[PDB]
Amino acid sequence: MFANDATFEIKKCDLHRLEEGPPVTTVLTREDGLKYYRMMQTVRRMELKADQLYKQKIIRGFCHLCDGQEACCVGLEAGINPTDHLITAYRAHGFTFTRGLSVREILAELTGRKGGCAKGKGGSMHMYAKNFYGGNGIVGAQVPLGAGIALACKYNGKDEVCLTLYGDGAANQGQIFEAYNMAALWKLPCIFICENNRYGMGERAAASTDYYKRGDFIPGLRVDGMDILCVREATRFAAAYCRSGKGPILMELQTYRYHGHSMSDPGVAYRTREEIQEVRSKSDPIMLLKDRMVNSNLASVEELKEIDVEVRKEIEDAAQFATADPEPPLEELGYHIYSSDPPFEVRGANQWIKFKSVS
Amino acid sequence: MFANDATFEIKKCDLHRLEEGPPVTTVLTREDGLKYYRMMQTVRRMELKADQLYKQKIIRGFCHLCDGQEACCVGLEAGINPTDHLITAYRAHGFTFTRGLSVREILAELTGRKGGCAKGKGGSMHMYAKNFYGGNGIVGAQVPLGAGIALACKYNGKDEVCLTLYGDGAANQGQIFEAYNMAALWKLPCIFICENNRYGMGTAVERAAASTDYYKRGDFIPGLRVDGMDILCVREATRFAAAYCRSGKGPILMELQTYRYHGHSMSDPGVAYRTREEIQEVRSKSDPIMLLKDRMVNSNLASVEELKEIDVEVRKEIEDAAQFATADPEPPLEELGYHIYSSDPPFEVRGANQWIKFKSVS
Amino acid sequence: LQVTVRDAINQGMDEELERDEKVFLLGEEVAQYDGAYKVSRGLWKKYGDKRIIDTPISEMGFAGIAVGAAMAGLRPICEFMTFNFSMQAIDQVINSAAKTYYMSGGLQPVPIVFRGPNGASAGVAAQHSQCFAAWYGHCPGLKVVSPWNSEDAKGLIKSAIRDNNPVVVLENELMYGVPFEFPPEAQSKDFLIPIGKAKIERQGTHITVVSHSRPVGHCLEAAAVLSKEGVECEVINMRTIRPMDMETIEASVMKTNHLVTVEGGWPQFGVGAEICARIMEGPAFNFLDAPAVRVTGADVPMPYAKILEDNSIPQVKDIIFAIKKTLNI
Amino acid sequence: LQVTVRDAINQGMDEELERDEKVFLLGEEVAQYDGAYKVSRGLWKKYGDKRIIDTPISEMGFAGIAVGAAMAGLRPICEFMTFNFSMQAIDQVINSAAKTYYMSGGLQPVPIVFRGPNGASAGVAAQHSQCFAAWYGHCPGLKVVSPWNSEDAKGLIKSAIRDNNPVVVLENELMYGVPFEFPPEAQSKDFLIPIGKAKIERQGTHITVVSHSRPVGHCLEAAAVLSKEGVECEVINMRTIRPMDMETIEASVMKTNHLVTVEGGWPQFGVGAEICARIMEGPAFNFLDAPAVRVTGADVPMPYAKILEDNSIPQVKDIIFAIKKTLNI
Numbered sequence A: 001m002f003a004n005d006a007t008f009e010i011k012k013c014d015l016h017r018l019e020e021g022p023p024v025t026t027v028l029t030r031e032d033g034l035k036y037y038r039m040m041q042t043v044r045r046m047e048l049k050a051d052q053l054y055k056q057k058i059i060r061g062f063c064h065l066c067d068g069q070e071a072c073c074v075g076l077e078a079g080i081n082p083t084d085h086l087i088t089a090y091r092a093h094g095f096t097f098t099r100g101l102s103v104r105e106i107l108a109e110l111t112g113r114k115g116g117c118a119k120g121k122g123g124s125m126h127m128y129a130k131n132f133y134g135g136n137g138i139v140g141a142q143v144p145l146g147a148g149i150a151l152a153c154k155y156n157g158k159d160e161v162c163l164t165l166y167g168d169g170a171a172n173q174g175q176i177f178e179a180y181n182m183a184a185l186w187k188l189p190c191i192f193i194c195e196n197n198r199y200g201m202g203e204r205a206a207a208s209t210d211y212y213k214r215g216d217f218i219p220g221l222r223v224d225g226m227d228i229l230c231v232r233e234a235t236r237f238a239a240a241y242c243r244s245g246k247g248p249i250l251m252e253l254q255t256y257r258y259h260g261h262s263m264s265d266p267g268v269a270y271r272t273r274e275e276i277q278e279v280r281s282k283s284d285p286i287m288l289l290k291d292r293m294v295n296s297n298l299a300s301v302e303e304l305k306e307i308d309v310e311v312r313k314e315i316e317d318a319a320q321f322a323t324a325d326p327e328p329p330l331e332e333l334g335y336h337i338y339s340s341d342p343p344f345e346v347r348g349a350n351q352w353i354k355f356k357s358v359s
Numbered sequence B: 001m002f003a004n005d006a007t008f009e010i011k012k013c014d015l016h017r018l019e020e021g022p023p024v025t026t027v028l029t030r031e032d033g034l035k036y037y038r039m040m041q042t043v044r045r046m047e048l049k050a051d052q053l054y055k056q057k058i059i060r061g062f063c064h065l066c067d068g069q070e071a072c073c074v075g076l077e078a079g080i081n082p083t084d085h086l087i088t089a090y091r092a093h094g095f096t097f098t099r100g101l102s103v104r105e106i107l108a109e110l111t112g113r114k115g116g117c118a119k120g121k122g123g124s125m126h127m128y129a130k131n132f133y134g135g136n137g138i139v140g141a142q143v144p145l146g147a148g149i150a151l152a153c154k155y156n157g158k159d160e161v162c163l164t165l166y167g168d169g170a171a172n173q174g175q176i177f178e179a180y181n182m183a184a185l186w187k188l189p190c191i192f193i194c195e196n197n198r199y200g201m202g203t204a205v206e207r208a209a210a211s212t213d214y215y216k217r218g219d220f221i222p223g224l225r226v227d228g229m230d231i232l233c234v235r236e237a238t239r240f241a242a243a244y245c246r247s248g249k250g251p252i253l254m255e256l257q258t259y260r261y262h263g264h265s266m267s268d269p270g271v272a273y274r275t276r277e278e279i280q281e282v283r284s285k286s287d288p289i290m291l292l293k294d295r296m297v298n299s300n301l302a303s304v305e306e307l308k309e310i311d312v313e314v315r316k317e318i319e320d321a322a323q324f325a326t327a328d329p330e331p332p333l334e335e336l337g338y339h340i341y342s343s344d345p346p347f348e349v350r351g352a353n354q355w356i357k358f359k360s361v362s
Numbered sequence C, D: 001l002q003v004t005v006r007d008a009i010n011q012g013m014d015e016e017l018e019r020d021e022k023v024f025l026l027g028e029e030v031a032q033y034d035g036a037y038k039v040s041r042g043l044w045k046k047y048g049d050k051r052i053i054d055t056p057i058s059e060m061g062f063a064g065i066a067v068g069a070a071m072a073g074l075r076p077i078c079e080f081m082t083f084n085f086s087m088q089a090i091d092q093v094i095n096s097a098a099k100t101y102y103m104s105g106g107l108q109p110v111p112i113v114f115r116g117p118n119g120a121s122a123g124v125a126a127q128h129s130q131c132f133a134a135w136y137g138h139c140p141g142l143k144v145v146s147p148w149n150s151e152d153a154k155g156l157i158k159s160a161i162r163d164n165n166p167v168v169v170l171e172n173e174l175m176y177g178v179p180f181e182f183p184p185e186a187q188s189k190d191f192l193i194p195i196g197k198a199k200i201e202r203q204g205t206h207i208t209v210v211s212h213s214r215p216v217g218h219c220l221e222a223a224a225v226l227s228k229e230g231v232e233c234e235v236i237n238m239r240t241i242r243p244m245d246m247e248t249i250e251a252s253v254m255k256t257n258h259l260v261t262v263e264g265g266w267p268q269f270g271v272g273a274e275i276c277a278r279i280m281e282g283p284a285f286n287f288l289d290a291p292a293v294r295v296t297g298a299d300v301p302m303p304y305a306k307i308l309e310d311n312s313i314p315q316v317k318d319i320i321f322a323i324k325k326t327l328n329i
């Protein structure tokens, strides 16, 4: 027999212009623990498969992976409603899955096939789903977009909120500051979220690394981004704040990504590989959740091994669908340039090439 | 017999991330008082004349007047060296005068004539001089420019600093925040100055800024808020900010609280979004020239008679310059094409159809 | 009934706001100031802070908020005080708005409108005179219109608000106060002008003259003058820059055998270049008895001094002169 | 021997840094990272923090800082990681840099270089594939260049750094890794290619084929194939977009009587439109035995999937097809 739920300690958040933050203690039911665990694993395995298909050259152009940051996408989803809105940058595979896309439609978008959620038209950086606005390749551009989505929530009067994510490297984009100002002035229910993984490609670049305070007049909290329950509580708190009418808030997530450190100075890259290995072994998100669930008697060691096995299977079914699936046919090159219009022609590489465009 | 100098008490500045601010008393010599007074009165009559030229259609397009803000441009000039660098936006007439251009060249530019400082090519918004870089019409664009001029100062190592000016409406430009971060990262000797005249066209500060403490917007950059109607306050706060940059501590924010008597530009009467009686209270309790007048009279630095004479001299002088600017011929059409590129051999520019060609020389 | 272009646009926005509470207007000074050039006069008083929104001077930011509001299903009208200032926001117009329905595989529409005056004013000099028609016309996923008179302006604004994709409406400051008569069918709240369709404003048989925006009126005065000498111009008002209505230009050229394009923008890679290349690649090339030629703005940043500016924008004279070279008279 | 386009650009920057201490390099990852696409490799080790300056991701800001540094007499090379990201900063390029010498009456020069990769790469989709030649080429005050091979690349960044006005150098990612034969004179520190002059890469008599950047090499492949059936193409590499060397294109067309333009960017209002407008307006018009036509990027945001992307960029077969239509064979 298993414990039905248990209490855990979570890092206190540093606060900016708040007198109280989220609790330092929280309750995990075993049912939730199981669901969060499956979800983080599904994202971990999906990203390991994408890395494999990328290196095989089956996936092209970009393929930013988020393994290491699973506590973020799964924790954020745990703190909000399906009817809330979320937009992020290009490292979006996890979010695409936590907002309800299958591993199939995600990997098949990555391998550029007809069965991709975007029909092979977008690839890694541009995936959309219900109340998930991408998947956005221009650093910083998604922050105003999210502020707009938040404006739409306020305007519709339905008490929904918008989570608007940017990384530490994006944090010095001017348009983020333009957004902070309008959000605060118009009391938008926008949660401004800095995913801080210590790298923006390869404080060389930020005068302040206190991301949670950069909104100045907007309040902010700093959260342990490696702890799924910690992200869950902070998000619950941050969404409460916006729903209640108090305007925007900042949440800085302190997390870490295992991929995309292809530094070419040998000293720096050696050191970065050590760091990757330290973070993985001391604060891996999934491992952290596992230790907790076993240790509080919320689930069994072998029960999670069973989940790993079902997940390996889901991902394997999805990889082979994504490598066998046909590419979109050529005659659909010009499809979906405009919404709601009658069919028209688009020019190809010379005037004698015509593609039909339908909405 | 007149005193040669006197000590004044100046408003204490509000500080952001600074342990101490500029001094709250300073010394004014009679020679400087006379000089500051004349320069401010010149700018005032220059702008009043530009108003009148504009209403006559002799000046076209944009024309943004800075009367009410004379303590800023004259105060700023008095805390820096001629070797320092300054950049601002389009409300630039006083700066172009305090920075070296004559009134003839400024008015002749506004009336679009060949004796203008750019020979009529730029008009109200685009005047340059030695260490004066405009005169920029796109709100906010000048701030990264100022941050780059400051970069050049550090690069050449001569200890010059750069004053980078923007208005309160411009304080919400994203690119201002990009410059802050870079200037703090590289310790650029850039003085970011927010001229806060309480409006950004017809939009009150409260309605466009969630936080109206401009001096604190740079966050990690230190700042000071300064009484921008008092020329001695501007002089001191500048003197302090320059020394701060020149000592290698990097950038600093300076907010001047000031006021414009005119609308945003000549088409805006400036009364739909604020009351006539608000303008009148400011002119009446805080006019930069009258605050100066009173200081020098009550401390015997100069007589009421003496300063009237200045007024009369300056008013005749602006009258002379104006006649020059109205009578001065337009630039010749031949020159339409000149100065597209620097240092190139001559070439041809196409006019409104292919048969029309203008010579372009550097 | 005479109605100015400014009032035509205002009626258009008013009617569309009334018809659909998802429509709202945002930008600098659109609300309590009654609009920078008074286009949005009365709108705030009538619809309130929720629908008519004064913004800080944060173009990239508010253009992006607007695009985000459209992705979430609202229908904003995002004003640029002039199009010169959309350059700070042009990333949001092109990469967040134009390309998205395509990148998303037809899952994510962006029903946003961008509007504001475009091109040359009088004495506003180089940073405030720029024409953006060819820039925006260049981009797949956008529609781009450039109205001339009052009908054009009201019908295109309303079509633009009704369309479900990003539309850039390039207005013109010097046209705002020009009155035109306004037939009772334009006065209607159902008046729509379809995007992608040019109008013939004057029939003729000797030459085809195509223009957009304010120079259209200059082509009409040039035709009135040439008419007294027996030369009949068929003057065509493009209305839409993307997707342009080349078919109507072709049928006119097969009738007249001669083509001159007229635009206010800079010449190289401008709008006339595209019409000429198309004419040359299409079925009407052989019907051409003389080279297609372009009348454009002079190829300089706009100078301030009056006599320089006059010679920097096409004038009636310049249109007539190109027309006479072309008909070899 | 052989040198890659990348290493050629790198040689020119190196030499220019060496020659003039006022020259410097800034942008994202140019220093310690050795260049996003490794073009600046070794510059920072060799010159240090003062001259090779990594910037935060703040394009409008570092772009304006570079322009500022230029107005004060320094000679910055400002790298956009790709030109797509230059849209954020395009106001600084056009309104702060391009127009300023003119607006100041010739008092304020702006010796700045904007460089980095432009156009289509492989699989990077629609926000990362844009070609900007026609956008920048449109603007008075700017010079704009577009190198194809290693010799182009090195000669033109050197000329650009030497010029005292804003120059946009539109490079190409896929060309970076391509090795070319590199004659001893290109290896010289004094090697310069003048802005404003095109180059005949292949003499021919039957048709003139004009291109820029990467597609130049496809024009040459096409030409070799056609050569085997007795069709001799004169292939012209533009090198400069503004001011384009139209005289060279004219004399070729007066020899060959036929013209096809080839570019990677979108068709409407693009580089080929200008070349054809000019050809029809100019003295070579009467020497054309067939209309000039354009080969271009397909008119859609760049799709991700391989087979779609392959058909959204000109291939040799689309060049050969347009030639055969043009010569009627």
Ligand SMILES: Cc1ncc(C[n+]2csc(CCOP(=O)(O)OP(=O)(O)O)c2C)c(N)n1
Pocket (backbone or CB within 6 Å): A064, A091, A137, A138, A139, A140, A166, A167, A168, A169, A170, A171, A195, A197, A199, A200, A201, D028, D057, D059, D081, D085, D088
């Ligand atoms: C405006 C813009 N500039 C540059 C790039 C190139 N670029 C892509 S990712 C990246 C690093 C951004 O890193 P960060 O925001 O920290 O997010 P992370 O990859 O760490 O999640 C850069 C410079 C871009 N996509 N957009």
Ligand SMILES: Cc1ncc(C[n+]2csc(CCOP(=O)(O)OP(=O)(O)O)c2C)c(N)n1
Pocket (backbone or CB within 6 Å): B064, B091, B137, B138, B139, B140, B166, B167, B168, B169, B170, B171, B195, B197, B199, B200, B201, B264, C028, C057, C059, C081, C085, C088
């Ligand atoms: C980027 C940009 N957006 C909008 C405008 C139109 N505009 C010109 S001045 C101005 C108001 C700026 O006010 P402020 O910064 O407070 O300066 P002030 O005139 O008060 O000195 C606006 C909105 C512009 N010139 N540039």
Ligand SMILES: [K+]
Pocket (backbone or CB within 6 Å): C075, C111, C112, C113, C160, C161, C162, C163, C164, C165
């Ligand atoms: K619409």
Ligand SMILES: [K+]
Pocket (backbone or CB within 6 Å): D075, D111, D112, D113, D160, D161, D162, D163, D164, D165
């Ligand atoms: K140069």
Ligand SMILES: [Mn+2]
Pocket (backbone or CB within 6 Å): A167, A168, A169, A195, A196, A197, A198, A199, A200, A201
């Ligand atoms: Mn990061």
Ligand SMILES: [Mn+2]
Pocket (backbone or CB within 6 Å): B167, B168, B169, B195, B196, B197, B198, B199, B200, B201
């Ligand atoms: Mn102001």
